[PDB]
Design a protein around this nucleic acid. Structure first.
Ligand code: PCY
Ligand code: MG
Ligand code: MG
Ligand code: MG
Ligand code: MG
Ligand code: MG
Ligand code: MG
Ligand code: MG
Ligand code: MG
Ligand code: MG
Ligand code: MG
Ligand code: MG
Ligand code: MG
Ligand code: MG
Lengths: 88, 119, 101, 73
RNA sequence: GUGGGAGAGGGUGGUGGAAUUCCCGGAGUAGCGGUGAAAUGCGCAGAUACCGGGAGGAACGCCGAUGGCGAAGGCAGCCACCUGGUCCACCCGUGACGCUGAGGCGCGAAAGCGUGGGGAGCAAACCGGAUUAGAUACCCGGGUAGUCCACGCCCUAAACGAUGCGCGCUAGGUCUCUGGGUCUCCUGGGGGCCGAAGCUAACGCGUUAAGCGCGCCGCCUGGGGAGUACGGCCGCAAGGC
C-alpha cells in the first residue's frame, strides 16, 4: 500500500504552491504513483484480471488529465512528464 | 457369551431397510440384525414392521451376552427409524438414552443425480 | 509494521521443562521475525471442543505483537514446525466491536 | 413462534470480535455446533455477520465445536 | 485532498472440520444394495451395520437472506499478504480537464481443444440389469473422456432486467443493506414491493421509468429458405465473426 507519508510526500513534492492538494500536476503525480505500484503488483498475479481494469482506468484518467494540461500550458506539461518519467 | 450387561444400540435407518447393531461399552459389536436378517426379502425389508422385528432380534440376541442397559444411536431417517427405537425401548433392555448421530456433509461430494436437484 | 495477535495451542502434556522449552523456540522465532511482543495472556490448559491430535485438551499461548507484515506468514510457517505446536493462528488486531452494550 | 428470549437479551456488553470468549459464544450455538439464526440470536445483520466469523475462529482454535450429537429423538 | 465505512470484488500462499471412496486393525454374521416391483451388483478370500488408525481428491454445512460485492461473465470454511472498485462527512485543492464511442485492445459461464499433473465423488460415450409391443430413454448396477491444477487455446449462451450509456426534470407510501446527523427521525449511496402524473397494443413500467427531454453508440424493416451458401477474417480442431 501507499503509506499516508508516501502520499503527502509526493503531494508536497508536486503541489503548485503551499496547499495545492489537487492541481493537474499533483494528480498526475499521485496517479502515476498508484499505477506503478499496481503495475508492479501485476508483474505477479498476471491472472488478477479484475485489478487490471483499475489500472486500465487509472491510466485513462491520467493520460486524459495530461491531455488537458498539454493543451492548456504546454510548458508545465513538459516539466511534469520529464520529471515524473511518463511517455516512452 | 462374555456378559456385557450394559452396551450401545445403533439404529441405522434408510428407506430401503433398517438395521440394528448392538455393541458394547466401547464400540465393538456383540450382535446385529436387519430386516433381511429376519424373513423379509426385498421391498418388505424397509417397512417399519421389519424395523420392529429386527430391533427385537437385535436385543434378544444381545440378551445372550447378558445385556440389560443400552444406549441408542440413530443414523439416518426412513421407512421406520422410530419403530426400531420403540421396539428396543420395550425389548427387555433399559434404554438409557437415544441420540441422532446421523451424518451430514458440510458439502463434500456431488451426490448421484438421484439426490441432486436442489441448491 | 502492523499490529497482530498470535495464537498458539501446543501439546497439553509438556512437563515444566519440555513446555517452557517450546516457548523458548517461540519467543526466539518471534524475534527472528521482527515480532516485538506488546504483551501476553497464557491461559494454559483448556478442554478442547473436539480432539486436537487425539488429545482432548490443549495449552494456549497468546502473544500480541507488532511486526513487519511483509513476513507475518513466514512467522507462522516457522511456529507450526514444532511438533508440540498443534495450532497456530495470527489474527489482525482489531478494535473491540461491542454489542448489546 | 421461536420466542423463548433473544440470546442477545440474556447477556451483557460483549465484544463480538472476541474469538475467545467461549463462555459467551457458547451461547449462540444451537444444541449442535450450529450458529443460531438471527431470529434467535437476536443480533443485527452487521453483528450476526461478525459473530459468524468470530465463532468460526473459535472452532478452528479448538475452543468452540463444529457440531454436537442430538439427544432424545 | 484529509478523515471514515461495508463488502462471497480479484491474485498468491497457508490452513480447519464434516462427509464419501480406498487401505490397515478390532469386534461381529449372512446378508447388503437397490426398486413400482425386480434384477444386475457386492458378500463366508467374511460383505453390510459398529469402533480405532491411515491415505487422497473434491466441496465448504449452520450463519445464509427476501442479504452483499463486481463492468459483465461471476463471487461463500478460516488466515495473512498483494490488489481493484465503491460510498459517506468536511467542503480544503484543480478550474470544463465533460459525455458518448465506429475501429483497437482487454475481459468473457459451461462444453470443447493442446502439453504436463491430478483423479475421492460425479458422470457424455460405453458395458450391463429392468420396463416396454419395441426402449438405441426415462428406473437400477458399473464406468471412460470430463469435472480438479498449471500453462496455452476456444469466445459461445434464455452471456436475461429478453430493458446500451450519461445528465436534467416529474406525488407519495413501505420493507431492506450500508454511511452521516442535532439518531422515536433527517439526510446520502444500494437493494425490493405499492402506487401520483404520465406512458403502453395489452400485460405492465412508474425518482432502480418502460414517464418528460438533450447527447453519442449498437440494432430492426413479413414468414420459410437460413445463421444456411459463397467470399473473407479468426481457430490446432471443433467451430466462430
Ligand atoms: C406397478 C408399477 O409401478 C409398474 C408395473 C409394470 C411395469 C412398470 N414400468 C416402470 C419401469 N420400472 C420404469 N422405471 C421405474 O422403475 N421407476 C422408479 C418409475 C422404466 C424401466 O424406466 C417406468 C418409468 O417405465 C415405470 O415406472 C412406468 O410403468 C407404469 O406406470 C405401468 C403400470 C403402473 C402398470 C402396467 C404397465 C406400466 O408401464 C411399472
Ligand atoms: Mg479496497
Ligand atoms: Mg473550495
Ligand atoms: Mg481561482
Ligand atoms: Mg471449463
Ligand atoms: Mg484438457
Ligand atoms: Mg456413478
Ligand atoms: Mg447411471
Ligand atoms: Mg470462456
Ligand atoms: Mg433507494
Ligand atoms: Mg394513473
Ligand atoms: Mg409498479
Ligand atoms: Mg421473401
Ligand atoms: Mg486455417
Amino acid at each position: 500500500p501507499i503509506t499516508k507519508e508516501e502520499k503527502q510526500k509526493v503531494i508536497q513534492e508536486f503541489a503548485r504552491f503551499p496547499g495545492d492538494t489537487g492541481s493537474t500536476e499533483v494528480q498526475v503525480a499521485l496517479l502515476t504513483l498508484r499505477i506503478n505500484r499496481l503495475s508492479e503488483h501485476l508483474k505477479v498475479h498476471k491472472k488478477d484480471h479484475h485489478s487490471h481494469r483499475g489500472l486500465l482506468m487509472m491510466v485513462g484518467q491520467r493520460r486524459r488529465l495530461l491531455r488537458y494540461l498539454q493543451r492548456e500550458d504546454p510548458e508545465r506539461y513538459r516539466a511534469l512528464i520529464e520529471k515524473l518519467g511518463i511517455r516512452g | 457369551k462374555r456378559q456385557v450387561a450394559s452396551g450401545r444400540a445403533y439404529i441405522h435407518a434408510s428407506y430401503n431397510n433398517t438395521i440394528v447393531t448392538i455393541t458394547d461399552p466401547d464400540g465393538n459389536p456383540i450382535t446385529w440384525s436387519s430386516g433381511g436378517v429376519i424373513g423379509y426379502k426385498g421391498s418388505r425389508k424397509g417397512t417399519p414392521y421389519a424395523a420392529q422385528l429386527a430391533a427385537l432380534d437385535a436385543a434378544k440376541k444381545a440378551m445372550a451376552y447378558g445385556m440389560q442397559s443400552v444406549d441408542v444411536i440413530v443414523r439416518g431417517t426412513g421407512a421406520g427409524r422410530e419403530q426400531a427405537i420403540r421396539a428396543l425401548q420395550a425389548s427387555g433392555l433399559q434404554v438409557k438414552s437415544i441420540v441422532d448421530d446421523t451424518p451430514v456433509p458440510h458439502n463434500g461430494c456431488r451426490p448421484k443425480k438421484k439426490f441432486r436437484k436442489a441448491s | 509494521m502492523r499490529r497482530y495477535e498470535v495464537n498458539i495451542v501446543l501439546n497439553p502434556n509438556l512437563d515444566q521443562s519440555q513446555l517452557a522449552l517450546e516457548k523458548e523456540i517461540i519467543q526466539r522465532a518471534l524475534e527472528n521475525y521482527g515480532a516485538r511482543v506488546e504483551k501476553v495472556e497464557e491461559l494454559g490448559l483448556r478442554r478442547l471442543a473436539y480432539p486436537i491430535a487425539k488429545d482432548p485438551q490443549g495449552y494456549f499461548l497468546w502473544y500480541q505483537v507488532e511486526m513487519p507484515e511483509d513476513r507475518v506468514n513466514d512467522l507462522a510457517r516457522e511456529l507450526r514446525i514444532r511438533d508440540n505446536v498443534r495450532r497456530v493462528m495470527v489474527v489482525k488486531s482489531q478494535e473491540p466491536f461491542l454489542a448489546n452494550a | 413462534p421461536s420466542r423463548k428470549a433473544k440470546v442477545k437479551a440474556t447477556l451483557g456488553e460483549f465484544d463480538l470480535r472476541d474469538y475467545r470468549n467461549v463462555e459467551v459464544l457458547k451461547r449462540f450455538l444451537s444444541e449442535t455446533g450450529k450458529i443460531l439464526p438471527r431470529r434467535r440470536t437476536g443480533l443485527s445483520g452487521k453483528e450476526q455477520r461478525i459473530l459468524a466469523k468470530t465463532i468460526k475462529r473459535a472452532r478452528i482454535l479448538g475452543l468452540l465445536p463444529f457440531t454436537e450429537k442430538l439427544v432424545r429423538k
